[PDB]
Amino acid sequence: MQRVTITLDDDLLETLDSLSQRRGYNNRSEAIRDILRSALAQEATGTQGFAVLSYVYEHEKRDLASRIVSTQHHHHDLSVATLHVHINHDDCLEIAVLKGDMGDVQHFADDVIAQRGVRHGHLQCLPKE
Amino acid sequence: MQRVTITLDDDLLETLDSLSQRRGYNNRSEAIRDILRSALAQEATQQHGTQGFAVLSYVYEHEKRDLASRIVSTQHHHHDLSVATLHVHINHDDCLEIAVLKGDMGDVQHFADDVIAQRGVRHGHLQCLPKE
Amino acid sequence: MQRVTITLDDDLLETLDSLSQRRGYNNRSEAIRDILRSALAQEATGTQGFAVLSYVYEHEKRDLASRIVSTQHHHHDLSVATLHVHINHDDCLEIAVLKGDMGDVQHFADDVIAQRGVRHGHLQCLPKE
Amino acid sequence: MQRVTITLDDDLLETLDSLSQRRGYNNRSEAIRDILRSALAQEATQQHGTQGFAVLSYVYEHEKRDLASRIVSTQHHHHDLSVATLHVHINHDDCLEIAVLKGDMGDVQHFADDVIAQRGVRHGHLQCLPKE
Ligand SMILES: OC[C@H]1O[C@H](O[C@H]2[C@H](O)[C@@H](O)[C@H](OCCCC3CCCCC3)O[C@@H]2CO)[C@H](O)[C@@H](O)[C@@H]1O
Ligand SMILES: OC[C@H]1O[C@H](O[C@H]2[C@H](O)[C@@H](O)[C@H](OCCCC3CCCCC3)O[C@@H]2CO)[C@H](O)[C@@H](O)[C@@H]1O
Ligand code: NI
Ligand code: NI
Numbered sequence A, C: 001m002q003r004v005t006i007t008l009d010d011d012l013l014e015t016l017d018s019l020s021q022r023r024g025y026n027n028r029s030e031a032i033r034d035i036l037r038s039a040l041a042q043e044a045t046g047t048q049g050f051a052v053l054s055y056v057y058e059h060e061k062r063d064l065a066s067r068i069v070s071t072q073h074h075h076h077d078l079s080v081a082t083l084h085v086h087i088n089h090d091d092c093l094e095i096a097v098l099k100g101d102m103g104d105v106q107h108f109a110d111d112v113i114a115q116r117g118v119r120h121g122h123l124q125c126l127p128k129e
Numbered sequence B, D: 001m002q003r004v005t006i007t008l009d010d011d012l013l014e015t016l017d018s019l020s021q022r023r024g025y026n027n028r029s030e031a032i033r034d035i036l037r038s039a040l041a042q043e044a045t046q047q048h049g050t051q052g053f054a055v056l057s058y059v060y061e062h063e064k065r066d067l068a069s070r071i072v073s074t075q076h077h078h079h080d081l082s083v084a085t086l087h088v089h090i091n092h093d094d095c096l097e098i099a100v101l102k103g104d105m106g107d108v109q110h111f112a113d114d115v116i117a118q119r120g121v122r123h124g125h126l127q128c129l130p131k132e
């Protein structure tokens, strides 16, 4: 067993402690060691497949409604279908199911979320494997 | 029962006959009686004061005139009637969209119009399933 | 202008009259003439395109949940994606978006709705034209 | 601020290093600090007593063992948490499904488990967007 010293800010530690107590850990190291185990295990996650793109945006702002649909049409091949739920008067929750090469999928995601007016962008890839 | 006579013009009649022919009908009363029942029956499912769910389909060419931004804005104005919308990019220009609505079958009718009656939207189609 | 005499049962006429009065028609003929106009106009509705299949079914009954998904997988090519809303504890509202030759679409619809356990089956075809 | 020392075993560490390498990290505190914040932050969005919406994705092979009938039955048991589910037939065996949920972020967590924790379901993934 090796050792590693990290520096953490007060608020993070305050939440982490609140959690280590309740979740039944003897101390910070024990609790952090556990989060690492799960997190790294998820890193066991090739060129083609499907993907789920989630994100929230406001239809008005920079005419995003039109922009995001136009964008998706430029890559309509990669697009399978898009689910959309109106959450409030301004925001919209959208989920685009994508098919094709992961490279194209990665690019598609950027065209949609890496821009002003879009929040909570999330992309899960499901490669053929 | 009760017999009723309808006054039809030469044109409307030549129509009812070629289409009834194509659809296997050999008799006008039958062709007309079904069209009628089919109508009044759909007329029903739409009444106000009845709850339920509905399916609204339609195709639109996103570019035109902010139909995307206006179609989406219209659904937000009535967000309480919307459950979720499914959109499929048909080709570089056409958008197939399907919206599930729940609530008063009446208000739904309105909603279908506010959208289906928008310059640029075609193939509109509603289907109300009263909660029974 | 030609003439056509049809026979209608009491209840239908009772609804039709209630309607002709309120909707402002002078009589049955005037009201029926109007329904015909619209109905026949809709008959202006070739081999390929998309379609929307709607229907309601109860997940339990004859294991429909599994059957309808298995069915759709036999024709997964014609299937683009399927929306599903749980309406109550027993019934489900499902809408399948279909792509392909109308012939295949017509067949697909029968495999899904023309059977016990399924209600309100509806199919709108959108051919490439 | 505050410095903390973690006791790691040779294996967990060789892991954190090859994966941090692949991801461009050159320092362990940074690799670990982000993993941590990312975790506690997601831990948050899930609390009970907060409303909102969520996205639940997962893949399943419909045949297996009535996973179709059981997955769908489970969603009906909690129908109030469901908004709508989107299903895509990946291939002759795999079903990609996406369910939108709204309500207490807490109950949602449960729901994700009742399904994601079903023999035959893989690639499960939740994303809670607290109504703020
Ligand atoms: O688009 C990718 C995702 O990016 C962010 O989450 C990332 C976060 O930005 C990243 O820092 C973390 O990785 C933790 C950093 C640890 C690395 C991986 C393992 C080896 C060492 C570095 O993963 C999460 C998702 O799981 C967003 O919060 C999420 O909504 C989005 O979908
Ligand atoms: O699957 C096709 C549709 O079949 C039924 O509606 C049909 C009805 O069964 C038919 O009888 C009527 O046609 C009226 C009969 C008139 C014919 C057409 C014109 C020429 C003469 C005959 O159309 C409606 C739909 O529009 C169902 O109620 C509907 O949910 C379903 O989607
Ligand atoms: Ni050691
Ligand atoms: Ni193209």
Ligand code: NI
Pocket (backbone or CB within 6 Å): A059, A084, A085, A086, A087, A091, A092, A093, B072, B076
């Ligand atoms: Ni919206």
Ligand code: NI
Pocket (backbone or CB within 6 Å): A089, B079
């Ligand atoms: Ni409101």
Ligand code: NI
Pocket (backbone or CB within 6 Å): A074, A107, A111
């Ligand atoms: Ni691009």
Ligand code: NI
Pocket (backbone or CB within 6 Å): A126, A127, A128, A129, D123
């Ligand atoms: Ni996989």
Ligand code: NI
Pocket (backbone or CB within 6 Å): B001, B002
């Ligand atoms: Ni009589």
Ligand code: NI
Pocket (backbone or CB within 6 Å): A069, A073, B062, B087, B088, B089, B090, B094, B095, B096
């Ligand atoms: Ni589109």
Ligand code: NI
Pocket (backbone or CB within 6 Å): B077, B078, B110, B111, B114
């Ligand atoms: Ni309105």
Ligand code: NI
Pocket (backbone or CB within 6 Å): B125, B126, B127, C122
């Ligand atoms: Ni119809």
Ligand code: NI
Pocket (backbone or CB within 6 Å): B129, B130, B132, C119
């Ligand atoms: Ni019914």
Ligand code: NI
Pocket (backbone or CB within 6 Å): C001, C002
């Ligand atoms: Ni005449």
Ligand code: NI
Pocket (backbone or CB within 6 Å): C076, C077, D092
């Ligand atoms: Ni095949």
Ligand code: NI
Pocket (backbone or CB within 6 Å): C059, C084, C085, C086, C087, C091, C092, C093, D072, D076
């Ligand atoms: Ni259901």
Ligand code: NI
Pocket (backbone or CB within 6 Å): C089, D079
């Ligand atoms: Ni209930």
Ligand code: NI
Pocket (backbone or CB within 6 Å): C074, C107, C111
């Ligand atoms: Ni078949």
Ligand code: NI
Pocket (backbone or CB within 6 Å): B123, C126, C127, C128, C129
């Ligand atoms: Ni057309």
Ligand code: NI
Pocket (backbone or CB within 6 Å): D001, D002
């Ligand atoms: Ni300090």
